[PDB]
Structure 1
């Protein structure tokens, strides 16, 4: 009954075109270990074969047309992806497609465009007179032609770009007659501009087309939902309308989670309010608390984990996570949760009652960057925690955040899941004990640490309490033998 998401990629995976086939082959393992949905990387053609997918050259080329030096995307062909989805669906695993609609990269040709420079620290401030630039804005899709969509893109579908090809210069340019979209993040004055050619969501043909593409994408891949990329750079009312639109056209629930990247609960709450709470967000503040705890050597106050997070205020709209493709080593938002702490963080997201937790491919299987700081494969340490969630993390919760280091929580179990109930402890410093209440209904049961970190049994007393142990900088999750 508990649902668990997996982000099924990391940044540095090899460009061998076998990822979709790998996903197909992993479907039995995923289903067996309690994964109920996967977020797949962007499935459409990027600026090159080795694009992770955020380039977003051609949204209608799912590895089907010979464009940018390749038919396949990094991850494989359309047919291979459709087969992977078919295998996942046969095991009741839902699939969330990544939606990259902030920008378009890798335009087929430049156009001459009149523009002004803007201050990268305050994009509302103009820093030049008008000048003629060569911007990468013409999309003709020569390998695809009009198959699926005859929509062509031109400079006037965008607000701006970061590159003038004529002078060969990297600045933020705003096109003549354009205005940055609102509402977006107010960072850098207005954070509409991020990268490549920035889509103009004031343009009514653009809003219609991105909506029409959304339905097409959902149909083509039989998606159950979406992950929205870079949403702090995209007109909030448009994202609301897009989600409603696709739900209306498909007639499906289409669970959606947006990546609004800001370590700030208030900003996230503003985004939720302005999108009418129609979709979830990733719990970025919780990720930064995990990173903080993992880097402070026991000095972190573990009590802080209960506050300042999306999951603490809006649990039904929080997708909780430990690390992702932006926070992994070497990447643009690097804030990796250190390996020693990582299982403790997974206990926090997987065994507590609030939030929709997500497991990271890079944590399960390791990351394949070129550094000596890559995340090691932690599958074996995460699996017992996944099993705790799947089989034991049910029923009423009791919190014990009553200590700088050793914090814990229990779950009483639910009569709908036989033998359910658990008692979790984590500590960023010295180990020790904590007595916790697991429910009088569990009186006299013998519980053991499903992680194997502690080998002692705990017998629950008549009053429903057990004396639970945890090792230094460790995690233990006791459940009925």
Structure 2
């Protein structure tokens, strides 16, 4: 009954075109362990076959046309993708597609365009007069043609770019006269009527072509909010489906996140970036972190229904752009936090489950065996009223009284970044007389609940204990 999301990709996975098949083959397992939704990587053609998917060359080429020297994307062909989705739906698992719409990369040709240079500090402070540059702005899709869409991109559909091809220069350009490869990407202009109309149309095309159930919105911090709000309303309306949507607004600031939510009318969720940073901070301070701090400054604490909680993702993993990996020892504690507490729509990271494949000497190992018990705790026991016990600097915990709707439901969780200990927690008089055991197997001793519903729970240092049944 509890929903659980899974980011089904890692940055360093092999470019062998078998990913869609792996996903398909992984459906039973996912269902076994309570995964109710899967967020797949960008399925459209990038700047090269090896593109992780954020280059975003052609949104209408889901690994179907020979473009950028390949038919398939890094993950597979459109057909394999469609088969994987079919098997996922047969198992009652929803699929959320990634949406990369703040820029387009890998233009087919440059265009002579008039531009002005702006201040790197204040990107709306002109520090140059108008002048001609050659910008990678012409997209015509030679391999696709007009199939699915005859819309062609030109410089006027964009706000600017960071590369002048004529002078081979890197500066911040803003196009004038309108009605390290990433430096050549062009920033999409949502003030242009044709652009806003086209992205909304592709949006519903995308949802229908793959039978998607929702979306993951990429890099929303720089996209016009009103547009994002309307794009979401639009796809839901044209489609007639719920279309759960979560946006990646990367800002470790509850303030900025709430504003984003208010400006977008609360029509979609946001990743709990602040929570991740606390997880990282705690895993980094060797027991010096005040564990009672986890309950504040996060999105779940304020907008539980609008938060997608996560431990790490493809941006924070070792070697990436926003690297701030939660240390392995702390990882299972963070997972217990997001998977067994009532608030938030938790997300499990593929890289944490099966390990990351970068070449740092600090890659994430496959934690599947440590996480599986917590997924089971969420799937079968995390129900009913919750009681919080964040009364200590090191050891904190919470209980779930369970729900009659779900048999033997109920749990007592305990996590500590410092030394081990015990804590008496109210578990529900309804559970009185029961003998509970640590599902993570970290503690061997049983705990029998008293007649008043209380229990003395224990936990090892720098560890996690989740007592059930």
TM-score (norm 2): 0.99
Could you tell me whether the CA contact under 8 Å between 2:355 and 2:366 is conserved in 1?
Answer: yes
Flag the 1:235–1:410 CA change in 2: closer, same or farther, 3 A. same
Flag the 1:384–1:470 CA change in 2: closer, same or farther, 3 A. same
Q: Per-residue CA shift, 1:307-366, capped at 9, x if unaligned?
A: 100000000000000000000000000000000000000000000000000000000000
**Which residue of structure 2 aligns with residue 67 of structure 1?**
67
Distance 2:5 2:271 in 1: 12
Q: Per-residue CA shift, 1:55-89, capped at 9, x if unaligned?
A: 11000000000000100000000000000000000
Aligned-pair CA distance for 1:177: 3.5
Distance 1:4 1:108 in 2: 40
Flag the 1:193–1:239 CA change in 2: closer, same or farther, 3 A. farther
Q: Per-residue CA shift, 1:279-313, capped at 9, x if unaligned?
A: 00000000000000000010110001001000000
**Which residue of structure 2 aligns with residue 196 of structure 1?**
185
Is 2:153 the counterpart of 1:164? no
Could you tell me whether the CA contact under 8 Å between 2:353 and 2:367 is conserved in 1?
Answer: yes
Q: Which SS does the other structure have where 2:270 is aligned?
A: strand
Aligned-pair CA distance for 1:446: 0.5
Q: Per-residue CA shift, 1:264-284, capped at 9, x if unaligned?
A: 000000000000000000000
Could you tell me whether the CA contact under 8 Å between 2:114 and 2:177 is conserved in 1?
Answer: no
Q: Which SS does the other structure have where 1:112 is aligned?
A: strand
Could you tell me whether the CA contact under 8 Å between 2:314 and 2:320 is conserved in 1?
Answer: yes
Could you tell me whether the CA contact under 8 Å between 1:159 and 1:178 is conserved in 2?
Answer: no
Q: CA RMSD in A?
A: 1.6
Could you tell me whether the CA contact under 8 Å between 1:103 and 1:195 is conserved in 2?
Answer: no
Q: Per-residue CA shift, 1:131-172, capped at 9, x if unaligned?
A: 111100000000000000000000000000011111111111
Q: Which SS does the other structure have where 1:142 is aligned?
A: coil
**Which residue of structure 2 aligns with residue 280 of structure 1?**
269
Q: Per-residue CA shift, 1:7-29, capped at 9, x if unaligned?
A: 00010100000000000000000
Aligned-pair CA distance for 1:204: 0.2
**Which residue of structure 1 aligns with residue 76 of structure 2?**
76
Q: Per-residue CA shift, 1:355-408, capped at 9, x if unaligned?
A: 000000000000000111111100000000000000000000000000001000
Distance 2:372 2:184 in 1: 38
Aligned-pair CA distance for 1:194: 8.9
Flag the 1:442–1:241 CA change in 2: closer, same or farther, 3 A. same
Could you tell me whether the CA contact under 8 Å between 1:160 and 1:193 is conserved in 2?
Answer: no
Q: Per-residue CA shift, 1:240-261, capped at 9, x if unaligned?
A: 0000000000000000000000
Distance 1:465 1:192 in 2: 60
Could you tell me whether the CA contact under 8 Å between 2:3 and 2:36 is conserved in 1?
Answer: yes
Deviates more, 1:155-164 or 1:115-124: 115-124
Q: Per-residue CA shift, 1:199-247, capped at 9, x if unaligned?
A: 0000000000000000000000000000000001100000000000000
Q: Which blocks of at least 5 consecutive residues in structure 2 are unaligned?
A: none
Could you tell me whether the CA contact under 8 Å between 2:55 and 2:182 is conserved in 1?
Answer: no
Q: Per-residue CA shift, 1:177-205, capped at 9, x if unaligned?
A: 459xxxxxxxxxxx999971000000000
**Which residue of structure 2 aligns with residue 144 of structure 1?**
144
Matches within 5 A, 1:443-462: 443-462=432-451
Question: 310, 314, 318: which is aligned to 1:329?
Answer: 318
Distance 1:194 1:442 in 2: 60
Q: Per-residue CA shift, 1:443-478, capped at 9, x if unaligned?
A: 010100000000010000011001100000000000
Q: Which SS does the other structure have where 2:25 is aligned?
A: helix
Aligned-pair CA distance for 1:442: 0.2
Aligned length: 469
Distance 1:267 1:334 in 2: 21
Aligned-pair CA distance for 1:119: 1.4
Which 4+ runs in 1 deviate beyond 4 A?
A: 191-195
Q: Which blocks of at least 5 consecutive residues in structure 1 are unaligned?
A: 180-190
**Which residue of structure 1 aligns with residue 458 of structure 2?**
469
Could you tell me whether the CA contact under 8 Å between 1:344 and 1:474 is conserved in 2?
Answer: yes
Flag the 1:4–1:231 CA change in 2: closer, same or farther, 3 A. same
Could you tell me whether the CA contact under 8 Å between 1:192 and 1:233 is conserved in 2?
Answer: no
Distance 1:320 1:194 in 2: 31
Distance 1:311 1:328 in 2: 22
Distance 1:409 1:172 in 2: 50
**Which residue of structure 1 aligns with residue 259 of structure 2?**
270
**Which residue of structure 2 aligns with residue 5 of structure 1?**
5
Distance 1:176 1:430 in 2: 62
Distance 2:182 2:106 in 1: 16
Flag the 1:26–1:268 CA change in 2: closer, same or farther, 3 A. same
Flag the 1:159–1:406 CA change in 2: closer, same or farther, 3 A. same
